[PDB]
C-alpha cells in the first residue's frame, strides 16, 4: 500500500517481507532482515551524471557546546569531566515558562566546568565544553 | 559523442541542457528558439557569434502536465543578459500568460553584458515588468544553480519561491570588491551571499539542496502540488489512504504539565496523509512551520506553531514567513489548516527598534484578507493578540475547534491577578492565581461566548478535518471592490 | 460651566471632546451615540456605569466635506475597549464604507478591559477585520494622543498614516515590566516606545507634532489633499499660481563638479505651487523624500532622491518608505512625479544580513504595478538597477525627461574599464576612463536608444510637467485579472 511499511513479495515459493521507511526521490530507505539500507534508484542520465557531483564532508568538530537561546538552567544531568554518549540529555534551561533540554549529539567524553544551578546568564555561553 | 561538455564536467558541474533533460519527462522537451545571435557590433564583439545566444527555452512536460522553462548557460559569455536574450524570456512568459501554465527558471547568469550598453538594463526592466504583472496569475518558481550577482537578483526575488544549490551557488546585490573599497573589510563570496546565509540570516531562499540531481527530483515533487493557473481548480490525486484510519495516539501528545515542551510534528503528521509533507524554509524561524501537504488526496496549506523552539512565540521573521505563505496559498485557491499554540509576542527592545508593529500586522492582514476555506485547531493555549492573529473565528473563519485541555484568556494568570487587585492583602498569589486560572483559563468560557464551534476529542481531528474540507469545497466569498490593497510593508 | 474637566486640564492635557471640537468645523459635529452602558456584571463592575462608555463617535464636517471620526476617553476606565465600545466603531466604519467617506481616529486607550474577558479580543478582531477589508477603499488616518499599549496597537498599523504627539504619547506591544522580567533590563516607557523612537528607529510613525492644537491645524491641511473615496476623482482647488511663472533658477542648481552635493528641495520647490509641500516621514531615511504637493491646483505625489544625505543611495528603509507611498498614491488615483539621482545601492555586509534583496524589490514592485500617470525627470545620474527601479520608461512610464548634463550608464567608469580590459598595459586608467566617460556617460546614448523622450532645458520643467499632467488626465489602464498580487513581504 502506498506510503506504508509492510511489503509482501513472493517469487515462486520463497516469500519475503520488507519494510519501507522513506525516501527523497533518489534514495530509498528500505529495511531488509531487520536492518536499514539506502538503495539508489536512478535512470541512465542520473547514473551517468552522479559521477560528476561534488561530495563535501561535513564539519567534524569535537569542541564546546553553546546554548542556542537565553534562559535559566534549573536541572543538570551530566557530571564535569566524565564520559558522554550520543543522545544523552545534559541539562535543562527554562525560559518564558518552558523547560527545554539540550543533549549531547555525539561524542565520547568532555573536559569543562559546569554552569551552576540557577545561573540566569545564558546568552550563548559555553555551558559544557567537549574535549 | 560527448563533445564540448568535457570541459564543463571536469569542474564537477552540470550543463544547462543536462539540467533541462533531468527536469522534464524523458522525451517531451521541444526547444523553442535555437539559432539567434547578439548583433552587437561594438568593442570587438562583431566576431564570436553564438548560435544559442546563451539561453535554452522550451516547453517540456512534467507528470503529463505542461510547463515552460528557461535555463542560463555559463559557458557562453558567462550567461550575461542582452537585448536579445531577454526577448526569448519575454516571449515565453507572455505565452505562459495567455495559456494557464507556470514558468520555472534556472538562473546561472554572471551579471549584465557590458558590451551592449543600456540594452541590458532594458531587458532587465522588461523581465521585471512581466514578473510584476503575472505574479498571482501563474505560479513562478526559481532555482539558482550558480553565481547570480548584479541587478539580475531582483527577478528571482519577485518570484514565489527561490531555491538554492549548496556547493556552487551564491547571490547578492554588490560584489565584495566594492565592500572592500568603501568599508575596508575582506569578505569572501560565500561568506557574503552563500546558500547558508540566505537560508538562515536573510530569509530569502526557500530551501537548499545538496546536488542538482536531488534538486530536480524534489522539484518535480513540488510541482505535483501546484495548480496549473489562477482559474484552474486545486489538483486532486488518487490515494489509498482513507479518513477512517485510526489515530488515537493524539490523546497523549500534549503533556499534563504546562511547562513541558513537545514537538508539533507529532500532531501534524497523523492528520495528513502518509509521507506527504513538503516543508518550506526549514532552517529559518524554526518556531513556526509552513509547507504543503495532502488531506484525502487534495493539496492543502499547513501553518503551525512549535513550542519546541522559543516556547512557540511569534516574532518578526515568523510573521513574514507566515504572511508570505498565506498570501500565496490564498492567491491560488488552496485550503489552509492551522494549529495554534502561542503565549504571545517576543518581548525585547531590539524588537521595537526593529519594527515589530509593522511586521506582526502582516500576518494578521494576510489572515483577514483571505477567502479560501480555513480550519483552525487550538491545542493548548492562545493569549492576547496572538489569539486574534492566528486565524480566529471572528476573521471570517469557517470552523474552529479546541482540545479539552485548551486555554483561551486575555493574558497569563499573574498579570490578571495583579491588575484586578492593586494593593490587596499580601500572599494574594496563592489563593487568587489558582482560582483565576481554574475559572477562566479553560475553553469553557470561550465556548460559552461562541468562539469555538465544539470541544472535541483529539482522536477525531482527522475525521472532522476531512468532513469540513469536503463540505467547504464550493465556497464563494468576495471582498469589496478595490484596485488593490495597502498592506503594511 | 466648566465642570469635571478641571481635573483633566490640571495635568496639562486636553479632553476627547475638545479635540473633536478643534478638528471639525465650528458647529458641524453631530454626536451619534451617547447613552450606552457596558452591561458586564462581573468582578464588582455591576456598579459605576457610564453614559458615554468611554467613546465619542460622530460625523462632523471639514472644509465643507464630510468625515467620520471617533475618539477614546482616558478618564473613563482608562479608555479600555469592550464588547460594547467596539460596536460603535464597527457601525461607523460600516457606514463610512457604504458612503464614500474617510475615517479618522484619535487613539488614547490604555489597553484592553480585563473585566470583560475574551469579549475585548472579540471587539479587537472585528475592528481588525474592518480595517483589513476597507483598506484601499476609504483613506484611514490615525493619531495617537496618549498611551497605546497591548494588542490595540495593531489597528493603527494597518491604517494608511499614523501620527504622534510629542510629550505625552507612546506605543509598543509589550510593557517594560515584562522586558525586565525576562531580559532583566530596566527601560522607561519613553525610552521604549516614545515618539522619537518610532520617528527615527522603527519607521512606524509618519510624523510628529509638538502640540494637540498644531496637530489639529495641520491634520485639516492634510485632509484638504485627500480624495473622498476610491471611486471619486482627485480634488482640484482654485489657485492664482500659473504655469507661466518664470523658473530660470533651475539652470544653476546642479554644480559643474561631479563630486559636489546639492539639496534636491531646490529642484522640488520651484516646480510645485508656492507653499504647498507636506513632507511625510521627515526624520526617517533622509536620503529619500516623499510627500504630497499641488501642481496647477491638483494634488500630486512627490518622490525624489537627495544627494545631500549619503550620496542619495537607495537602502532598505528608503525602499520601504517609497514603496508604501507609491502603493497608497496609486490606490486612490493620484499622479506621481519623481526626480532621479542615484549612484546605486548601499554596499555592506549588514545589508545582505538584513535582506536587501527582499526590501529593494518592494519599490520596484510598487512602481511596476502602478497604473496612474507617471512623470520622471533624470537630473544628473542613474546607474545599474537603481535606474531600472526608479520608474524607468520600460515600466509603462508615460513621459520621461533628462537634463543636458545627465548620465545613464551600466556602472561607474572605473568598473567598466576594469572589466573591458583584463590585463591591458598599465597606466590604462588615464587614457581609458576619461574616454569611456566621455563617450558613454552622457544622455546621448540613452536618447539614441529611445529611453528618454527628449533632452530639455532645466527652465522648462514646470511647463512640461503641467502640459503632460493636463493631457494625461483621462488614462485608463488595467492589469490582468487576479484575486490579488503576491508582493515580496
Ligand atoms: O511572567 C513574566 C514573563 C511572562 C512571559 C510570557 C510569554 S514570554 C513572551 C510572551 N509575552 C508575554 O507577555 N507573555 C508571553
Ligand atoms: O569605486 C568604488 C566605490 C564606488 C561606490 C559608488 C557608489 S557607493 C554605493 C553604490 N554602489 C555602487 O556600486 N556604486 C555606488
Query: What DSSP line would sit under C71-101, residue for residue?
Result: EE-STTGGG-B-TTHHHHHHHHHHHHHHTT-
Indicate the SS3 state at residue A93.
strand
C-alpha to C-alpha distance for B295 and C160, rounded to whole angstroms: 39
Q: Which of B63, B343, B79 is nearest to B221 (CA)?
A: B63
Question: Is B5-224's fold the same as B249-472's?
Answer: yes
- Confirm if B171 and B159 have CB atoms less than 8 A apart: no
C-alpha to C-alpha distance for B229 and B139, rounded to whole angstroms: 7
C-alpha to C-alpha distance for C21 and A5, rounded to whole angstroms: 74
With cell 491646483, the residue in question is C297
Q: Can you say how many angstroms the Cα of residue B148 is from the centroid of all Cα atoms in its chain?
A: 21
Strands C298-305 and C336-342, how do they pair? parallel
Count Cα neighbours of C423 within 13 Å in the Cβ-side half-sphere.
0
Indicate the SS3 state at residue C305.
strand
Q: What are phi and psi of B430, to 5 degrees?
A: -65, -45
* Experimental method of this PDB entry: cryo-EM
Question: Looking at C150, C207, C397, C412, which residue is catalytic?
Answer: C150
Beta bridge partners, B468, equal none
The top-level CATH class assigned to C249-472 is alpha beta
Burial (0-12, 13-18, 19+ Cβ within 10 Å), B185: exposed
Q: What are phi and psi of C377, to 5 degrees?
A: -130, 120
Ligand 1 center from residue C181 Cα (angstroms): 9
Helices marked H in B370-411 — which ranges? 384-389
In this structure, how many other beta carbons lie within 10 angstroms of the beta carbon of residue B33? Answer: 15
Q: Which residues in chain A have their CB less than 8 angstroms from residue C184's CB?
A: 120
CB contact (8 A) between residue C182 and residue A96: yes
C-alpha to C-alpha distance for C481 and B137, rounded to whole angstroms: 7
The percent of chain B in helix, strand and coil, each rounded to the nearest 5, is 40, 20, 45
Distances, alpha carbon B461 to alpha carbons A7, B51, B249, B267, in Å: 28, 59, 11, 10
For an interface test with C, give the residue of B181, B385, B414, B441 to mutate (most C CBs within 10 A). B385
The percent of chain A in helix, strand and coil, each rounded to the nearest 5, is 5, 35, 60
B452: which 3 cell numbers? 469555538
Helix (H) or strand (E) run with residue B324 in it: helix B316-331
Q: Which of C309, C389, C374 is nearest to C344 (CA)?
A: C389
CA atoms B22, B24, B30, B32: torsion sign: negative
A30: which 3 cell numbers? 528500505
Strands A14-23 and A27-31, how do they pair? antiparallel
Q: Is B480 on the interface with C (CB under 8 A)?
A: yes
Helix axes B428-440, B413-420, angle to 10 degrees: 120
Beta bridge partners, C58, equal C31, C69
- Confirm if B387 and B415 have CB atoms less than 8 A apart: no
C-alpha to C-alpha distance for A86 and B102, rounded to whole angstroms: 46
C-alpha to C-alpha distance for B164 and B180, rounded to whole angstroms: 26
Beta bridge partners, C400, equal C376
Q: Is C100 on the interface with B (CB under 8 A)?
A: no
Indicate the SS3 state at residue C142.
strand
- Confirm if B469 and B298 have CB atoms less than 8 A apart: yes
Q: Report the pocket of ligand 2 as residue ranges, CB < 6 Å.
A: B 174, 178, 181-182; C 313, 343-347, 412, 414
Helix (H) or strand (E) run with residue C221 in it: helix C212-223
CA dihedral of B284, B289, B295, B298, whole degrees rounded to 10: -40
What residue ranges do the domains of chain C occupy?
5-224, 249-472
B102: which 3 cell numbers? 507556470
Is C151 in the active site? yes
C-alpha to C-alpha distance for B20 and B216, rounded to whole angstroms: 9
Is B485 in the active site? no
Q: Which of C83, C89, C27 is nearest to C57 (CA)?
A: C89
Q: What are phi and psi of A17, to 5 degrees?
A: -135, 120
C-alpha to C-alpha distance for C324 and C160, rounded to whole angstroms: 9
Q: What are phi and psi of C332, to 5 degrees?
A: -120, 20
Q: Is A72 on the interface with B (CB under 8 A)?
A: no
Beta bridge partners, C399, equal C375
Helix axes C119-134, B356-369, angle to 10 degrees: 80
Nearest to C446 among B118, B204, B358 (CB): B118
C-alpha to C-alpha distance for C94 and C91, rounded to whole angstroms: 5
CA atoms C242, C243, C246, C249: torsion sign: positive
B 219-248 near A (Cβ less than 8 A):
220-221, 239-241
Q: Considering every ligand atom shown, identify the ligand nearest to the alpha carbon of residue B181 and give its number.
A: 2
Nearest to B274 among A4, A94, A98 (CB): A4
C-alpha to C-alpha distance for B447 and B401, rounded to whole angstroms: 10
Distances, alpha carbon B90 to alpha carbons A71, B148, C210, in Å: 53, 19, 53
Is C150 in the active site? yes
A112: which 3 cell numbers? 569543562
With cell 489548516, the residue in question is B337
Burial (0-12, 13-18, 19+ Cβ within 10 Å), A62: exposed
Is C385 in the active site? yes
CB contact (8 A) between residue C137 and residue B482: yes
In this structure, how many other beta carbons lie within 10 angstroms of the beta carbon of residue B310? Answer: 23
Helix (H) or strand (E) run with residue C55 in it: strand C55-58
- Confirm if B274 and B241 have CB atoms less than 8 A apart: yes
Helix (H) or strand (E) run with residue B8 in it: helix B6-9
Chain A nearest-CA residue for C178: A96
C-alpha to C-alpha distance for A109 and B138, rounded to whole angstroms: 55
A89: which 3 cell numbers? 540529555
Ligand 2 center from residue C452 Cα (angstroms): 24
C-alpha to C-alpha distance for A50 and B216, rounded to whole angstroms: 13
In this structure, how many other beta carbons lie within 10 angstroms of the beta carbon of residue C162? Answer: 23
Q: Which of C408, C392, C394, C393 is nearest to C443 (CA)?
A: C408
Q: Whose CA is nearest to atom 13 of ligand 2?
A: C344
Q: Is C478 on the interface with B (CB under 8 A)?
A: no
Q: What are phi and psi of B76, to 5 degrees?
A: -90, 110
Q: Is B14 on the interface with A (CB under 8 A)?
A: yes
Residue B409: CB partners within 8 Å, gap ≥ 6?
Answer: B383, B416, B440, B441, C117, C118
Q: Report the pocket of ligand 1 as residue ranges, CB < 6 Å.
A: A 96-97; B 313, 343-347, 412, 414; C 174, 178, 181-182
- Confirm if C368 and B133 have CB atoms less than 8 A apart: yes
C-alpha to C-alpha distance for B103 and B23, rounded to whole angstroms: 13
- Confirm if C70 and C57 have CB atoms less than 8 A apart: yes
Q: Can you say how many angstroms the Cα of residue C167 is from the centroid of all Cα atoms in its chain?
A: 22
Q: Which residues in chain C have their CB less than 8 angstroms from residue B197's CB?
A: 352-353
Q: Which of C381, C382, C412 to mutate to test the pocket of ligand 2 (most atoms within 8 A of CB)?
A: C412
* Helix and strand numbers, DSSP H then E, in chain B: 18, 18
- Confirm if B326 and B337 have CB atoms less than 8 A apart: no
C-alpha to C-alpha distance for C402 and C380, rounded to whole angstroms: 8
Q: Considering every ligand atom shown, identify the ligand nearest to the alpha carbon of residue C182 and give its number.
A: 1
B 114-173 near C (Cβ less than 8 A):
114-115, 117-122, 124-126, 128-129, 132-137, 150-151, 153-154, 157-158, 160, 171-173
C-alpha to C-alpha distance for C360 and C389, rounded to whole angstroms: 9
Residue B29: CB partners within 8 Å, gap ≥ 6?
Answer: B20, B21, B58, B59, B60, B61
CB contact (8 A) between residue B361 and residue C154: yes
End-to-end CA distance of chain A: 48
- Confirm if A127 and A92 have CB atoms less than 8 A apart: no
CA dihedral of B319, B322, B325, B329, whole degrees rounded to 10: -120
Question: Looking at B150, B193, B194, B360, which residue is catalytic?
Answer: B150
Is domain B5-224 classified as CATH 3.30.565.10?
no
CA atoms B295, B298, B299, B303: torsion sign: negative
Distances, alpha carbon A25 to alpha carbons A38, B245, B259, B300, C38, in Å: 12, 26, 39, 21, 61
C-alpha to C-alpha distance for C206 and C321, rounded to whole angstroms: 10
Indicate the SS3 state at residue C445.
helix
C-alpha to C-alpha distance for C144 and B159, rounded to whole angstroms: 38
Amino acid at each position: 500500500k502506498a506510503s506504508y511499511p509492510i511489503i509482501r513479495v513472493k517469487d515462486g515459493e520463497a516469500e519475503t517481507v520488507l519494510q519501507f521507511w522513506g525516501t527523497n526521490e533518489v534514495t530509498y530507505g528500505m529495511q531488509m532482515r531487520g536492518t536499514t539500507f539506502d538503495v539508489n534508484v536512478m535512470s541512465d542520465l542520473q547514473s551517468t551524471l552522479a559521477h560528476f557531483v561534488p561530495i563535501t564532508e561535513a564539519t567534524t568538530n569535537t569542541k564546546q557546546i553553546l546554548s542556542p537561546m537565553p534562559g535559566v538552567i534549573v536541572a543538570i544531568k551530566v557530571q564535569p569531566g566524565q564520559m558522554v554518549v550520543a543522545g544523552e540529555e545534559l541539562l535543562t534551561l527554562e525560559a518564558m515558562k518552558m523547560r527545554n533540554k539540550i543533549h549531547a549529539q555525539a561524542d565520547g567524553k568532555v573536559k569543562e566546568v559546569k554552569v551552576k544551578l540557577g545561573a540566569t546568564v545564558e546568552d550563548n555561553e559555553v555551558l559544557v565544553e567537549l574535549e | 559523442p560527448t563533445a564540448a561538455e568535457d570541459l564543463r564536467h571536469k569542474k564537477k558541474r552540470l550543463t544547462a541542457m543536462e539540467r533541462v533533460q533531468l527536469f522534464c519527462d524523458p522525451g517531451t522537451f521541444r526547444e523553442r528558439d535555437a539559432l539567434v545571435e547578439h548583433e552587437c557590433h561594438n568593442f570587438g564583439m562583431e566576431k564570436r557569434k553564438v548560435p544559442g545566444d546563451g539561453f535554452i527555452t522550451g516547453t517540456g512536460k512534467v507528470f503529463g502536465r505542461p510547463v515552460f522553462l528557461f535555463s542560463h548557460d555559463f559557458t557562453v559569455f558567462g550567461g550575461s543578459l542582452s537585448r536579445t536574450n531577454a526577448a526569448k524570456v519575454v516571449r515565453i512568459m507572455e505565452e505562459a500568460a495567455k495559456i494557464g501554465v507556470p514558468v520555472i527558471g534556472f538562473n546561472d547568469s554572471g551579471g549584465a553584458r557590458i558590451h551592449e550598453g543600456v540594452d541590458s538594463l532594458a531587458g532587465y526592466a522588461d523581465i521585471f515588468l512581466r514578473n510584476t504583472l503575472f505574479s498571482g496569475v501563474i505560479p513562478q518558481i526559481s532555482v539558482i544553480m550558480g553565481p547570480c550577482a548584479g541587478g539580475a537578483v531582483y527577478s528571482p526575488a519577485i518570484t514565489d519561491f527561490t531555491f538554492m544549490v549548496e556547493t556552487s551557488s551564491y547571490m547578492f546585490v554588490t560584489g565584495p570588491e566594492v565592500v572592500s573599497a568603501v568599508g575596508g573589510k575582506l569578505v569572501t563570496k560565500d561568506e557574503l551571499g552563500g546558500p547558508h546565509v540566505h537560508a538562515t540570516k536573510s530569509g530569502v531562499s526557500a530551501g537548499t539542496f545538496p546536488n542538482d540531481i536531488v534538486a530536480m527530483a524534489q522539484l518535480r515533487r513540488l510541482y505535483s502540488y501546484l495548480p496549473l493557473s489562477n482559474r484552474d481548480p486545486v489538483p486532486v490525486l488518487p490515494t489509498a489512504d482513507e479518513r477512517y484510519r485510526d489515530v488515537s495516539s493524539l490523546n497523549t501528545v500534549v503533556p499534563t504539565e504546562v511547562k513541558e515542551a513537545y514537538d508539533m510534528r507529532d500532531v501534524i503528521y497523523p492528520v495528513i496523509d502518509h509521507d506527504s509533507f513538503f516543508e518550506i524554509q526549514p532552517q529559518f524561524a524554526k518556531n513556526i512551520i509552513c509547507g504543503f501537504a495532502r488531506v484525502e488526496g487534495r493539496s492543502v496549506c499547513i501553518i503551525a506553531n512549535q513550542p519546541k523552539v522559543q516556547a512557540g512565540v511569534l516574532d518578526i521573521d515568523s510573521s513574514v514567513k507566515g504572511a508570505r505563505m498565506v498570501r500565496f496559498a490564498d492567491a491560488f485557491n488552496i485550503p489552509i489548516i492551522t494549529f495554534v499554540d502561542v503565549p504571545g509576542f517576543l518581548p525585547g527592545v531590539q524588537q521595537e527598534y526593529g519594527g515589530i508593529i509593522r511586521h506582526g500586522a502582516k500576518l494578521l492582514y494576510a489572515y483577514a484578507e483571505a477567502t479560501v476555506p480555513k480550519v483552525t485547531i487550538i491545542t493548548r493555549k492562545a493569549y492576547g493578540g496572538a489569539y486574534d492573529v492566528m486565524s480566529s473565528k471572528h476573521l471570517r473563519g469557517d470552523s474552529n475547534y479546541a482540545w479539552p485541555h485548551a486555554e483561551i484568556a486575555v493574558m497569563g494568570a499573574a498579570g490578571a491577578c495583579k491588575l484586578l487587585y492593586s494593593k490587596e492583602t499580601a500572599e494574594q498569589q496563592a489563593q487568587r492565581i489558582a482560582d483565576y486560572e481554574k475559572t477562566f483559563c479553560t475553553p469553557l468560557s470561550a465556548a460559552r461566548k461562541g468562539f469555538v464551534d465544539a470541544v472535541i476529542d483529539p482522536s477525531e481531528t482527522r475525521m472532522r478535518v476531512c468532513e469540513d474540507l469536503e463540505r467547504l469545497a464550493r465556497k464563494q466569498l468576495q471582498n469589496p471592490w478595490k484596485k488593490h490593497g495597502n498592506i503594511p510593508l
